[PDB]
Design a protein around this nucleic acid. Structure first.
Ligand SMILES: O=C(NCc1c(F)cc(F)cc1F)c1cn2c(c(O)c1=O)C(=O)N1[C@H]3CC[C@H](C3)O[C@@H]1C2
Ligand SMILES: O=C(NCc1c(F)cc(F)cc1F)c1cn2c(c(O)c1=O)C(=O)N1[C@H]3CC[C@H](C3)O[C@@H]1C2
Ligand SMILES: [Mg+2]
Ligand SMILES: [Mg+2]
Ligand SMILES: [Zn+2]
Ligand SMILES: [Zn+2]
Ligand SMILES: [Zn+2]
Ligand SMILES: [Zn+2]
Lengths: 296, 258, 278, 278, 258, 296
DNA sequence: GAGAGAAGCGCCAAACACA
DNA sequence: ACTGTGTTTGGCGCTTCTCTC
DNA sequence: GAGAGAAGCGCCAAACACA
DNA sequence: ACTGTGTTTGGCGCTTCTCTC
């Protein structure tokens, strides 16, 4: 078409929408490496021009712009996942996906964005379809997804408890129904960032959360791939209230592997961190059982 | 040029993929070269590991003081001719300058790290030091890179090779798991906390009066919002089409017109 | 007549006004005078600003400074990132092309790989070895106007800050080794001290996300030229020279022909506006 | 703790703030630091102004300047009236007390008899002959702070103006005699050129009616003293010295004891505020 | 001290009366000293008279170039060793510097004032020069004063005596008729013209913002009227009781508050 | 009493008036040189304090201040003249008179002075009594009187034609009735300053003035004591209109002394000035009679 | 019970030195 | 291309504090 | 006949040099 | 007492001018 900055402002938003519509068409690298090369080049150039334009002007976002860009995002990212294959493979269409992720990130964090316009454009279904994408094997996709989900959770207020219920449900499914998952670490980092912003006094459903989906989660045989982040979550929560540390102690004293295995050391690490905080406030109620358990 | 970059740097094939070359060309270059053919810490700069390694040369010995971050694998190496406590303190200070001040440090026992001088140095920096007696992979890859560089040319002052090797390990090579370089993973900003029952308001930057450089005017033209700010300059869109970096000496703080 | 009075005594403007002359006519006599403009050291020309990079690791700036400590004169090679102000400094015994190359490689290992770097016309920046090292990494090394230290203001100011911190450290513990003091000062500058205006440390700006793209630039300059009184930057003179006509002028300086054989580049600080001969 | 961090690295204010400290506490740490204040060359002290007479022929100001012409180095003795700016200049071959006395007598014959005159501590103003000549006419001759040319700004600026006019005259006619050029320049300055601000020539102000009386003055000064970091005017030093307590301070300078034997007078430009030891 | 003033100066008794001494003391001092015991021009600097006089010494001769104003008797004298046209031009320029540029000049014929050089010098200054061939009293009093000064002391460089004599004639001695000194009469401002059918309005001076010196303040305190203005300072009454000379660097122009 | 600046502003004008009243008492030096020495010293100090105070403050002159100071002036200056005695003698009480003259000069030229308040305080009688003082033999008194009369004439508008008639009458008396006068030069300087401010076209009474009191005035035997100033007046008037020069020519050709005398040269001087202006505009109507007259 | 002094804190223009 | 810049510092307006009639 | 360009003129803050 | 200051200069607001639809 034409460059977005070489048009008069009267119809500048019109060409904005039209060029947004240009990238709505799909391009699959998995089907064959060489297919519509110049179309793909035009799409990449258009995406670069859009992402450079969005971050250099003010009063750009307007009422009829909020749907379609998300729809464009909805066209490209939300799709059937590639078949599982257990160095992990890299997604074939990474360039276009990376540009789209960057453009969406800039679209959401722009100072002109109003959190009261997308309330009837972004709903629970969007969050479900986005969270189902966290199963992706690509680590770069996981990084961009987590850094986008953090902003989405922070900006909106009516979409918080629903995400909490959804993460509880997916944790229950992961720990009970299906053990195949690859995005434990990123979600744990987001959860830790959420935990850091709690206030006093701590509410009861936080206690239920930690007792149900945090402490039992240690039983997973694949803990080593996400050992630090999960631990940090615990090291992030207990500082709000030190009275609730004892149930964590009985949980870690029961989930400890009673047989010799290389997995022991990681447990010690978490205990060490807990120890480094458990010494003050005269916490010796469960010191003797803990010492007896670690003696064996 | 990926070919010359690999000739001088001898970095990994993935690093070549992040450049202009693609997977097939990166593999072809990698296999055509004659020479090339868990985590304990929770956060960056939280727990370190300090090793001392002996580098063997044809006619002399070198001492490599290496500090490795346990969360990202960042390496800080210093070359010395002897080994005492003073040089241990010097290497620690250089590592702090390159990376930052860690909260916890860990190293093996020996003549160094056990004297009163090292404990005094760690006390003033509020660094708690623990000793254990029995990573070793970063050391090995460092020795291999140094050997490759010396094989490429024997006429090096032993300083340029070390500096290049550190640059390659930290800035050029990319980790296989997280697809991030060691510098990128170590220095990636963390996720800010999310306050509860309070919306995360967007940060608003102040407005500025600006003057166009090279015009010798004495007029400040309009209070206007700044897109980005840097050291010695700030982005001001002079019109509705273009933006320019204006130095701080030509910018004055203002108030929102309301 | 104001004309003969000014040609005899070179009086002021109001002195011609009280003898009978309009303000514009007296002003025209003053600006049309040839001796009255070369002898007046007062001028008013636009100010220049050093070129700044569009993103981290775009443009660097380097210099060499001397430091006296324990009867030894150490030479500090200082490199500063133009975008964020991050400083990488290495202390050496002498000045040599090998020392400059080693300092540049250490700066690369500490901060990153820059595209363009500019320094003054020092004795060690113009050697064959330094140029070969720069072109091996595809780094464009440029030069400044000779004997014009103002064009490298950022790096000289960084040298002053570093020296001030070193003197502060040596005032308390005179027995502190040089390397310890330099490492502590570098850590304090890069990671602890915050910039005055943006209220962000150099380290946050250097490793801020590189997501913002590079704004497009326009190389279009002025198509006109004027007449300028010029002074040679190397040697200071009491009176202006010329006037002459600039072959071409850019932002911050102008190409002034010193003689009939070769031209030269003169900054805007040593140029004065002239009257049109035609 | 901000205290140990600043005692180790000497960081800034916000660097202490982000580690946990109120703004006032960090500011107190910064101003209570001993090394952080002697090494910083930045200070903020009130400016001084030369003493000005209350009426014409009250206070004069003199200096000696060099001029190169026809391979000869003439010495211009310049006297300026402080109230009106009237200039009397005499050109001589060498510098001697007799030359200074003759120049002063010529200035008296040209302008009038002054009461107080102040010059720098030149080699010819401190001789017995000059003092005897001054006391013969009941003229009080004072001296300035040594190696501080700023205290005689008016006369040095007048020297610059006179030299600029002489250079303008010699640019047109290089064969013009020195005495003719000096006479023409003196006439132009005193009778033709108008002052920038009051828009009146020096000659009108000098011979304006002396009807306005002399306003009464008050010699009452501040009764308090403070602690000052000081620098010797003669030799420039990188860092401040002291701090010490001033014996007595006046408007424009202060009496600072350099050593335990004798004190000295230090202008406000080389003094820095200190913290109270008690 | 009138006694020492007369000892050095040998001025008239009336000049002593203008000082602390009164008529009786002035007469007593005058008679106790051993050594002391029409107008053609219309305005000052309108018509001059130029004479050349020979001063006789014990072993040499001096040339005195004297220019006398015909309206006030102001004297400008220059001492020379020879007599040519160039020194005539130099003496004329010195007289212009001391007194100003006259409109008409008059002198006797001779080797000087008749050459092309003197006419060229007078033409550039817009001075018309007329010659007549036949004041003489100012010359005589100048010679008498010089003789008295040399009698008081023979060790004078012939320059200090001349400078003192000019000072005494112009600034110290007072005319008998108008009771004014020659400098006072020559440089007395003239009466400004009075426009007809228009009232002579009082000149109004601008207002100023001022800062008190020696306080390092950054505030300008009130637009206020200036009583008097001079070179490098101006009178500003800081309160309703006192006034102070404020330098121009601490003053800013303002507008009447109305 | 007390210093004028050491009193509160509420009654500052009261002490101003009181200290003005203090100098109303007379002190005569002619009667005896030594009489009330300390009273005279207090009077001199008070006068100096008043003259320094008046020129350092604003908004000082007030409605009840205008009379009395003039009355104080009226007390001191307007008096019987000393007996005539034909180096002229100096007035005995010069210090006090000089201070009073300076104070009156500063009082009239102060920027706070309003020319509409003294209109019913300064009348024709004041101008008569001031002009009768110009006969004083003291030259300093004449100088101060002329520099005061200039300002008085310039400031007021309704007192101009009356002064013109009075100067015409006194000129008639001087040239016809009584030949004893000493203030010719100062009045001529004031008249020349007035002439410099005329406009075009010149009015008829100016022609009558020059023809009646200016040209015949040359017949005075004592012309030499005021030769320049009078001449300047002529050299000041004719530039407004060059048509009226011829009657001046016939006047100077008739008042020329037909016999040899030293008085000739001064006449030539005036003619020279007239010549220096009469050459342009083709003025040769009376050139031949003038040449014939000067030939003899 | 309430309003004037007192401690806190963000901002800035003139100075200084980098050979 | 070519081109001066960042930190220190008392004074001051705006704001939030508490001892006193 | 009328309102937008064009010449006139008073003012000022940043620069410079006085060894 | 002791103590930095006066001139030059393009840019710009305010004002008074005249050629043009
Ligand atoms: O004058 C200098 N600094 C002081 C200063 C400033 F820092 C900033 C300003 F705005 C003004 C200043 F007066 C200065 C001088 N030289 C060099 C510098 O880098 C330098 O900063 C340098 O490298 N060379 C080499 C190239 C030829 C040889 C060697 O001499 C020159 C000397
Ligand atoms: O530095 C001088 N001028 C430049 C300047 C200025 F003018 C005004 C400023 F604000 C700053 C400046 F840098 C200067 C130096 N000296 C003398 C001067 O009069 C003088 O002006 C002088 O007479 N002596 C004698 C007493 C001891 C010997 C002889 O050295 C000093 C040297
Ligand atoms: Mg430098
Ligand atoms: Mg000097
Ligand atoms: Zn290789
Ligand atoms: Zn000129
Ligand atoms: Zn400190
Ligand atoms: Zn005598």
């Amino acid at each position: 078409l034409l460059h977005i900055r070489d048009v008069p402002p009267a119809d500048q938003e019109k060409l904005f929408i039209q060029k947004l519509r240009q990238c709505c068409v799909l391009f699959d690298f998995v089907s064959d490496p060489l297919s519509d090369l110049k179309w793909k080049e035009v799409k990449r150039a258009a995406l670069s021009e859009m992402v450079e334009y969005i971050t250099h002007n003010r009063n750009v976002i307007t009422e009829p712009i909020y749907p379609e860009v998300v729809h464009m995002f909805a066209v490209n990212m939300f799709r059937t996942l590639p078949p599982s294959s257990n160095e992990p493979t890299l997604e074939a269409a990474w360039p276009h996906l990376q540009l789209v992720y960057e453009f969406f990130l800039r679209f959401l964090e722009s100072p002109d964005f109003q959190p009261n316009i997308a309330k009837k454009y972004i709903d629970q279904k969007f969050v479900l379809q986005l969270l189902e994408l966290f199963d992706s094997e690509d680590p770069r996709e996981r990084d961009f997804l987590k850094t986008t989900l953090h902003r989405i959770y922070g900006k909106f207020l009516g979409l918080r408890a629903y995400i909490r219920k959804q993460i509880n449900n997916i944790f229950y499914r992961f720990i009970y129904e299906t053990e195949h998952h690859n995005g434990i670490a990123e979600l744990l980092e987001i959860l830790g960032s959420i935990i850091n912003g709690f206030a006093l006094p701590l509410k009861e459903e936080h206690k239920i959360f930690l007792l149900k989906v945090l402490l039992p989660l240690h039983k997973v045989k694949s803990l080593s791939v996400y050992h630090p982040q999960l631990a940090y979550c615990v090291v992030q929560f207990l500082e709000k209230d030190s009275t609730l540390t004892e149930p964590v102690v009985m949980a870690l004293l029961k989930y400890w592997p009673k047989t010799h295995s290389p997995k022991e050391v990681m447990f010690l690490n978490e205990l060490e961190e807990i120890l480094d905080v458990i010494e003050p406030s005269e916490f010796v109620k469960i010191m003797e059982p803990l010492f007896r358990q670690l003696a064996k | 040029s990926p070919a010359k970059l690999h000739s001088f740097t001898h970095c990994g094939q993935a690093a070549l993929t992040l450049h202009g070359a693609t997977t097939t060309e990166a593999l072809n270059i990698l296999h055509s070269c004659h020479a090339c053919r868990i985590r304990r810490g929770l956060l960056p700069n939280h727990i370190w590991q300090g090793d001392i390694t002996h580098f063997k040369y044809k006619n002399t010995l070198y001492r490599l003081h290496v500090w490795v971050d346990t969360f990202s694998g960042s390496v800080s190496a210093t070359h010395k001719k002897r080994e005492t406590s003073s040089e241990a303190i010097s290497s620690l200070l250089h590592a702090i300058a390159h990376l930052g001040r860690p909260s916890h440090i860990n190293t093996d026992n020996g003549p160094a790290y056990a004297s009163q001088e090292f404990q005094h140095a760690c006390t003033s920096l509020a660094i708690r030091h623990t000793t254990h007696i029995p990573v070793e992979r970063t050391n090995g890859i460092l020795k291999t890179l140094l050997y490759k560089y010396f094989s490429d040319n024997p006429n090096l002052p032993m300083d340029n090779a070390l500096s290049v090797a550190l640059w390659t390990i930290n800035h050029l090579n990319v980790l296989t798991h997280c697809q991030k370089t060691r510098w990128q993973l170590h220095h990636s900003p963390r996720l800010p906390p999310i306050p509860e029952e309070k919306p995360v308001t967007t940060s608003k930057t102040h407005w500025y009066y600006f003057k166009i450089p090279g015009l010798n005017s004495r007029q400040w033209k309009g209070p206007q919002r700044a897109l980005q700010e840097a050291a010695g300059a700030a982005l001001i869109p002079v019109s509705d089409t273009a933006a320019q970096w204006i130095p701080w000496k030509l910018l004055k703080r203002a108030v929102c017109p309301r």
